[PDB]
């Protein structure tokens, strides 16, 4: 040691770490980045559950983000900030199982509550190193301990031959779990309270958080949860065992391959090779045609999430859940004909019925008719501006809003304290067109407090709003309640109940309560539509 | 012998009575025979023209009501009695009435011909709410109404047979129209400006005359208030009518000719006993005998017919009231009564839907339930009560009316549409029924102008307004006052804009889309589902 900053040397179960004093707007923070939490899932270890990181010697340098798990890189709009912001930002490699910790500087006196971030990316992409997940502001301004882990995505993370020894399924979720275990054992070394661990995540990350709520071994590893624009139930977060098996076999064939023999072959294929084909498994025209997601294997998920949210005891659970104004808009540009970032995307009725088939690929002819009918404004059934917005809502409501309204519903009714929001503020800095509104993913930069960095060109009120949001989230991590125990002159955020179905709007104005989360429409998707398949 | 009350029609001479109306006298001619009494061997058969008569036939009093079920659900309650027969029941009933201004019109007056409702099982031209005195006095209109055969007497068919070919109640109506072409001039009427108006079954009948070629040269315009030829209750298929007929015959104990001869030999009241037992089927609209799609009077189902028709030179006024379905709930629908506020349980509501939409499969019931539920207050008895009313109103009246208005407009007719939202101060049903089926007629007919009836001074003006709308449409095809700038104007209903007006105490408001989303559900979705 000798000369090193003493505030930046920590020991964990695996050995010694040297961190980095990072500069934040209102003062310094500590970052320990790229701490390994598992033996690299490489070689024979591919597709297999993660093994804990065998202890190292000397002082590990933990001052940079590590490799990002091997994934498909988005190339729809080269140069485009609005898509690149999600692209991997460190080397792609299968050796990717590391996690990051941000803590106050100096590391705090008494043990602070911990927030853990599980990123999204539809289970096919993502990294804890992306800028919009920088934990420094929450660390600095809210005295929070923040942790984020890398977990395997795509085939490496989720390709499953259910029932086999060699590719059991859900290993991405199992990487996430090992990181939570690591948190329990080690977070205290950084002044973290292993008895106050809140999970938060967004899209597939929010679905992840939901599945930890539903998976017993993972239940003992956290206390509160926050699900932003995602759910474990719903059309895209899981697969039946058989389907997962079909998809893995099909991919195996595509790359040129008794389960052992099959996976053995797969394992000898180069990483990129697998990534190059993961999209071909469903020629099937479908936005959410991502083939490798969590499998209902009767192990990690003892049963479908839908089943488990209708029969679980959530007496002891505080949950924060919400959606953004325009969940679907973002998705339209990725293969719904007529939609683009570069024009107003006004579509024709023909393009609407066509987009409904693609957006809802599980839908029969009669169901597509049902959807089209429910979303048509019969005053102006030909108006392109409306149809455009309709197509957005269909995709948005089917994939996010209704699963979330359902999740809030069942959980509240089944003993949970649920708090629900809808995020309504578009970034002054947003680089997507006006027609896309407040799109899926664009709350994250606010929760994380990015507008506090003066160099980012956010308006003043955005900087105030960010602070306000960070208060809600961390208050929730702290107490199970987003409200302020002291200051109650500014309006209260009531729990969501079956009785009142109350949620609040998040935008530049003070809090506003509303009743009913797309109540009528979600009744369509959650109650009616299923039965139109018992036919 | 007042020579003004004396007219020579093709059958002979008639003497009218000088009736008194608020601001002047009118000439009535009540109970004119337009057909030979359809009695004995003539039961179930097309009407024949009435034979000429010697001397001066007394036409100063209303004639017999066609033989019908008399309603006994709420005995002595004026809400129901007002619809009940107000003269002797008798199979001998084919009589019409003409009201005209006194002295009788100097030049040819547009004629309005009324057709009563009653679901094709009840009704009379002679009811108080169809009194033609005001429309004749105040607007100088020649107003005609006729009795037509109802129930088994008017609509019992054994399709394709010679001796009960069906639709005779409609043929009665037609013959009155024929009579008006031939005779109405002699009263000062203009046979070149005949306008038909009717409510409920009367509306559907009007609509059937639109859809029947031989009727078309007998009128020029039409008004269909709260009814349509299309929709669930107004028509039956050849197959189904024949089944209902033979089942009626079996229920009274009875080869086509032999079956009818046996029916013909049966007292009228006997058929009325088993009238309501042909569809035991716990619904409301379990009335068995209605117009039948016969390849004759109706060449094809009204749906088919309104879909392909060319309605080029035709003007139509159509509309609904604020709460069509409330009325029908009190008739055989559990939880509903004129006596309590009728706040219902969710379970009641689901069974209520299986009853109100008796055509509905398990699934479509579920659809209807899920559509009409207020998902914010899923259990509130006020909403489920009001919802039940809506389901029944929409399915049977509102959506059929929306659909026809759309089709006529699409195929070149000129369409004016309304919603009637004023609840009569003198109404006798409870508040939860709002503005129920039927309760617009009294205003169109001018009843509040009669001080003895205790209608508010506001309601009396509202009447004059509606009377102007109707007669203005009768005169011109356009309900708008041709000498009223600063209106605002009543726009034609088109498929693009979808404009109707609200008829109530506040001056006209133009609204767009007549239950657009909900009727899309009824008119586009359910069909596919079945
Ligand atoms: C906008 O761009 C898309 C994709 O290039 C194109 O297909 C669409 O027709 C355009 N929209 C219009 C009609 O301006």
Short characterization:
The first copy, chain A, has 535 residues and is α/β, with parallel strands linked by helices. Chain A has helices at residues 81-84, 136-142, 154-158, 171-186, 204-214, 216-219, 241-255, 259-268, 271-277, 305-309, 329-332, 349-359, 365-375, 384-413, 444-447, 460-479, 519-531, and strands at residues 9-12, 15-18, 20-24, 27-36, 59-61, 68-69, 92-93, 98-104, 112-118, 145-149, 192-202, 224-228, 239-240, 295-296, 318-324, 417-423, 502-506, 512-515. The first copy, chain A, contains 17 helices and 18 strands.
Describe this structure in words.
Two copies of one chain form a homodimer. Chain A is an alpha/beta fold and 535 residues long. Chain A has a single domain, classed as Rossmann fold (3-Layer(aba) Sandwich). The first copy, chain A, has 17 helices and 18 strands. In chain A, β9, α2 and β10 (145-149) form a beta-alpha-beta unit. In chain A, α12 runs parallel beside α14 and α14 packs across α17. The radius of gyration of chain A is 23 Å and the shape is globular. The A-B interface holds A 366, 369-370, 373, 376, 378-379, 501, 515-516, 519-520, 522-524, 527-528, 531-532, 535 and B 363, 366-367, 370, 373, 375-376, 498, 512-513, 516-517, 519-521, 524-525, 528-529. Residues 338, 340, 343 of chain A line the site of 2-acetamido-2-deoxy-beta-D-glucopyranose. Chain B: Keywords: Cell membrane, Disulfide bond, Glycoprotein, GPI-anchor, Hydrolase, Lipoprotein, Membrane, Neurotransmitter degradation, Secreted, Serine esterase, Signal, Synapse.
């Amino acid at each position: 040691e000798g000369r090193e900053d003493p505030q930046l040397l920590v020991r964990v179960r695996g050995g010694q770490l040297r961190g980095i004093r990072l500069k934040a707007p209102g003062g310094p923070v500590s970052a320990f980045l790229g701490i390994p939490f598992a033996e690299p899932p490489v070689g024979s270890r591919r597709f297999m559950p993660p093994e804990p990181k065998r202890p190292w010697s000397g002082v590990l340098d933990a001052t940079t983000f590590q490799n990002v798990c091997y994934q498909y890189v988005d190339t729809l709009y080269p140069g485009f900030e609005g898509t690149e912001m999600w692209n991997p930002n460190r080397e792609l490699s299968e050796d990717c199982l590391y996690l990051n910790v941000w803590t106050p500087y100096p590391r705090p006196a008494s043990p602070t509550p911990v927030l853990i971030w599980i990123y999204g990316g539809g289970f096919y992409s993502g990294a804890a190193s992306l800028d919009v997940y920088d934990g420094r502001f929450l660390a600095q301004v809210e005295g929070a301990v923040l942790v984020s882990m890398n977990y395997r995505v795509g085939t490496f993370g989720f390709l499953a031959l259910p029932g086999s020894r060699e590719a059991p399924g859900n290993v991405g979720l199992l990487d996430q779990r090992l990181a939570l275990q690591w948190v329990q054992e080690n977070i205290a070394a950084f002044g973290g309270d292993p008895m106050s661990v809140t999970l938060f995540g967004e899209s597939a990350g929010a679905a992840s958080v939901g599945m930890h709520i539903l998976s017993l071994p993972s239940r003992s590893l956290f206390h509160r949860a926050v699900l932003q624009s995602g759910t474990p139930n719903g059309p895209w977060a899981t697969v039946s065992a058989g389907e997962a098996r079909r998809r893995a076999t099909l991919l195996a064939r595509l790359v040129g391959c008794n389960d052992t023999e099959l996976i053995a072959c797969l394992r000898t294929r180069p990483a990129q090779d697998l990534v190059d084909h993961e999209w071909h498994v469903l020629p099937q025209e479908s936005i959410f045609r991502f083939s490798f997601v969590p499998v209902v294997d009767g192990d990690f998920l003892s049963d479908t999430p839908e089943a488990l949210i209708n029969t679980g005891d959530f007496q002891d659970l505080q949950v924060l859940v919400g959606v953004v104004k325009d969940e679907g808009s973002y998705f339209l540009v990725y293969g719904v004909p007529g939609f683009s970032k570069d024009n107003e995307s006004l579509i024709s009725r023909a393009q609407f019925l066509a987009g409904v088939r693609i957006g809802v690929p599980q839908a029969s002819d009669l169901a597509a008719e049902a959807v089209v009918l429910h979303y048509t404004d019969w005053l102006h059934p030909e108006d392109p501006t409306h149809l455009r917005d309709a197509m957005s809502a269909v995709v948005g409501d089917h994939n996010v809003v209704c699963p979330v309204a359902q999740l809030a519903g069942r959980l509240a009714a089944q003993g949970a304290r649920v708090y629900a929001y809808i995020f309504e503020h578009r970034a002054s800095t947003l680089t997507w067109p006006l027609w896309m509104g407040v799109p899926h993913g664009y709350e994250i930069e606010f929760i994380f407090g990015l507008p506090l960095d003066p160099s980012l060109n956010y308006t003043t009120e955005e900087r105030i709003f960010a602070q306000r949001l960070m208060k809600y989230w961390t208050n929730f991590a702290r107490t199970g309640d987003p409200n302020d125990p002291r200051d109650s002159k500014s309006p209260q955020w009531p729990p969501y109940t079956t009785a009142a179905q109350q949620y609040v709007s998040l935008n530049l104005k003070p809090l506003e309560v509303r009743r009913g989360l797309r109540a009528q429409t979600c009744a369509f998707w959650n109650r009616f539509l299923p039965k139109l398949l018992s036919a």
